Design a protein around this ligand. Structure first.
Ligand SMILES: CC(C)C[C@H](NC(=O)c1cc2ccccc2s1)C(=O)N1CCN(C(=O)[C@H](CO)NS(=O)(=O)c2ccc(Cl)cc2Cl)CC1
Ligand SMILES: CC(C)CCC[C@@H](C)[C@H]1CC[C@H]2[C@@H]3CC=C4C[C@@H](OC(=O)CCC(=O)O)CC[C@]4(C)[C@H]3CC[C@]12C
Ligand SMILES: CC(C)CCC[C@@H](C)[C@H]1CC[C@H]2[C@@H]3CC=C4C[C@@H](OC(=O)CCC(=O)O)CC[C@]4(C)[C@H]3CC[C@]12C
Lengths: 617, 98, 60
């Protein structure tokens, strides 16, 4: 009777249901029998009834519920989960909440519907994973994400059952996590997201004063603030940063306080308990800066407390140590260069050290080798410090983090050769020296006047020049192969010499003498002319077009990128300090702005700023 | 013209010349160290030859005496590529923006 | 007097002036110094100047 019952329930007719209870009683057939359930997805009568209905009044639900009650299988029937993959775990309560009908939600909850059921189907998974909609996999979270304040209010406080707001799904995300996940930067979405977030946080704090909801962390270890920062959702992030609660009862959980006003000047005291961490836990600032592929990183960096904190941190110790860094590195490079120049070609390495100059010469090599080893150790410590960032962190951006690794290798590699491979240690030592000299732009990144230059040269080099060089290499290969084939000698050495001559020509110097020996000289000259014309005239200076366009983008965003680079370098410098010293350099005050519910002082670290307003009269 | 040449000269050209001098120092020191004569006068003569090359004239004859000529040519090619191709006319980008 | 003027209350200003409050007293604290020097607000270091800079025509 599955098809007939499905048709009856879909049509919404109530008279047809008459006589079903006697049939079930006589045949002792439960409403959850496999035959009744749809084989495709284990769907039952109730979800079909709730899916299709007229103005939210299908009118068949109470009769079916009474029938199930008479059969004595109400608990199993109401909360029967869907099987299969796409809609696994879905229940009747989720559907009732989705269709925005309060009456059916009340009915299901009163009759005993489970309120903690989790929907884990692939359709409910995040967008990037394959599911078109994600809401935290909970009824209350689903209601909150769909902008239904009345449903959330009723479900939180019900005489039958209550859905605790501090409940985590399989992913670990709680209601706030899901609300942030679906948050969008659109004008309309942000307003309701913030309103629901504030309402839910206030309710949770009111009901449970001891525990703060935002404290809970997901499996990834992030909090709603940290997750919003990582996902690039500025709309909720900025609101969370400057959250202020006027209510006296629950004003403790506020993040922005008022210090004092003198005339147009207003000084306010922000809180940064978790915004800045001295290695104790992950900080919003590090996640915002180091992480890649963030939609609105530049905008999120330009917030009231972030800029002031960066400025104060830079003034306190950043400038003092940055110049020390530059001086030490330049001195080491000068020592390395002097060691490289005064290298005795005569004799088999290693050499005996007996003379006065040996005292000075050996020290340079020892210092350079120890510096390379120190660089390698620093670069492995840093890699493990950031929890082993993947390829995207190293290769695509922060190229200097990789280059010093290469410099770390060669410098020590040569040493091995210097002990056994005496003959050819110079070949790689000189290349290491060149790379070390060339990779000093990391220290120039910080300077405001020349901060952009290094970033934009690194950007253009790998992206524009290589893309152009693909086509240039196509041309080079074709023309060089053609010219090599054409010439008549009357072979590897001849080909190499011809390639050398052609490269010398390509620079713009040399002489055109090859045509004399070859046959068909006229076509040879025609081909050379086409080569020169195409490459030099068009490509050589048409690359400059998009190169200048790239520099134009960098010029348009020069101020924004410099701020990012300066923040990166100062944070970099900070992170290498020991934990105890970092704690000794803590920034902010210990103002006891307010007392807890029991009266104990909060005594939380904060940071005060000030601004000027003239319209506040 | 006068105001903008005075402005660009001290601000753009010097900022670019810092990086250019880093490259120059590194490459020149490397090449001087690499060559085997068998010293101040030799270094000065090599620097003169390398500058004459940097302009775009002169001849590449130094490789004959030195050992490991292939790496020497590779390094010279990297020098020429980087400086001339990228920097020499990428300075022009921000110069034109100024 | 400076505080009374700042809080925009005319009554207390009248009371202090009538009772004999000094009207030429100068405030020279670092907080009152110019912005670039270290003081967040500068108004000439006088009561009348403070009232004028705060847009209080009646007090002036
Ligand atoms: C000691 C503190 C007061 C400051 C600290 N400087 C140093 O420890 C040393 C400098 C020098 C100079 C000559 C010889 C020996 C040393 S030891 C400092 O401020 N930093 C080092 C850690 N940093 C890094 O490791 C970046 C970011 O992770 N990676 S890197 O590109 O590979 C790099 C950059 C510069 C230096 Cl140099 C070493 C490295 Cl692997 C950042 C910046
Ligand atoms: C335009 C650019 C970006 C692409 C070309 C890459 C260069 C690095 C190539 C172009 C021509 C090449 C040269 C062509 C011929 C030779 C000679 C070869 O050794 C010889 O002198 C041959 C004599 C012999 O072996 O008997 C060593 C490499 C070198 C300099 C090659 C090294 C690499 C060069 C400079
Ligand atoms: C790219 C630019 C902006 C930076 C380089 C600065 C130039 C002014 C340097 C580059 C090479 C230098 C030259 C390298 C070698 C010499 C030879 C030296 O005297 C000699 O002829 C050496 C012979 C001897 O003393 O026995 C006088 C300076 C000169 C021309 C140097 C003078 C200054 C030069 C041209």
């Amino acid at each position: 009777n599955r098809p007939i019952l499905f048709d009856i329930v879909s049509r919404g007719s109530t008279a047809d249901l008459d006589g079903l209870l006697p049939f079930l009683l006589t045949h002792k057939k439960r409403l959850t029998d496999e035959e009744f359930r749809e084989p495709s997805t284990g769907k039952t009568c109730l979800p079909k009834a709730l899916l299709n209905l007229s103005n939210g009044r299908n009118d068949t639900i109470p009769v079916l519920l009474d029938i199930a009650e008479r059969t004595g299988n109400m608990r199993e029937f109401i909360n029967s989960p869907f099987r299969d993959i796409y809609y696994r775990g879905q229940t009747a309560l989720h559907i009732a909440i989705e269709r925005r009908c309060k009456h059916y939600v009340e009915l299901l909850v009163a009759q005993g519907a489970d309120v903690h059921a989790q929907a884990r189907g692939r359709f409910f998974q995040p967008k990037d994973e394959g599911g078109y909609f994600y809401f935290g996999e909970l009824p209350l979270s689903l209601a909150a994400c769909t902008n239904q304040p009345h449903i959330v209010n009723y479900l939180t406080e019900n005489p039958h059952k209550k859905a605790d707001m501090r409940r985590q799904d399989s992913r670990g995300n709680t209601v706030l996590h899901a609300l942030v996940a679906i948050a969008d930067n659109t004008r309309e979405n942000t307003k309701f997201v913030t309103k629901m977030y504030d309402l839910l946080l206030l309710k949770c704090a009111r009901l449970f004063p001891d525990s703060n909801l935002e404290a809970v962390l997901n499996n990834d270890g992030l909090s709603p603030l940290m997750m919003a920062a990582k996902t690039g959702k500025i709309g909720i992030f900025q609101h969370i940063i400057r959250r202020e609660v006027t209510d006296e009862d629950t004003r403790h959980l506020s993040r922005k306080f008022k210090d004092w006003a003198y005339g147009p000047v207003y000084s306010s005291l922000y809180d940064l308990s978790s915004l800045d961490t001295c290695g104790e836990e992950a900080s919003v600032l590090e996640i915002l800066v180091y992480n890649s592929k963030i939609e609105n990183r530049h905008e999120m960096l330009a917030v009231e407390p972030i800029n002031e904190l960066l400025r104060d941190k830079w003034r306190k110790f950043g400038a003092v140590s940055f110049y020390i860094n530059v001086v030490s590195y330049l001195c080491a490079m000068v020592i390395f260069t002097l060691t490289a120049y005064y290298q005795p070609l005569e004799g088999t390495p290693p050499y005996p050290y007996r003379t006065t100059v040996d005292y000075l010469r050996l020290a340079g090599e020892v210092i350079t080798l120890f510096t390379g080893v120190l660089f390698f150790f620093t670069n492995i410590k840093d890699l493990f410090m950031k929890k082993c960032p993947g390829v995207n962190s190293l290769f695509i951006d922060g190229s200097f983090q990789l280059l010093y690794f290469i410099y770390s290798v060669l410098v020590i590699v040569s040493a091995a050769l210097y002990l056994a491979g005496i003959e050819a240690y110079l070949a790689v030592m000189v290349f290491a020296l060149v790379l070390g000299w060339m990779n000093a732009l990391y220290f120039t990144r910080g300077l405001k006047l020349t901060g952009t230059y290094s970033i934009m040269i690194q950007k253009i080099l790998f992206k524009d020049l290589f893309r152009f060089l693909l086509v240039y290499l196509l041309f080079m290969i074709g023309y060089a192969s053609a010219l090599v084939s054409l010439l008549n000698p009357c072979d590897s050495e001849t080909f190499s010499t011809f390639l050398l001559d052609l490269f010398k020509l390509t620079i713009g110097m040399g002489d055109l003498e090859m045509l004399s020996s070859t046959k068909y000289p006229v076509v040879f000259i025609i081909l050379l002319v086409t080569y020169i014309i195409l490459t030099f005239v068009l490509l050589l200076n048409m690359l400059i077009a998009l190169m200048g366009e790239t520099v134009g983008q960098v010029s348009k965003e020069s101020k924004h990128i410099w701020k990012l680079q300066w923040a990166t370098t100062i944070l970099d410098i900070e992170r290498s300090f020991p934990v105890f010293l970092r704690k000794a350099f803590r920034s902010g005050e210990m103002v006891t702005v307010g007392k807890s519910s029991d009266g104990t002082p909060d005594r939380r670290w904060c940071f005060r700023v000030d601004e000027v307003n003239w319209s506040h009269w």
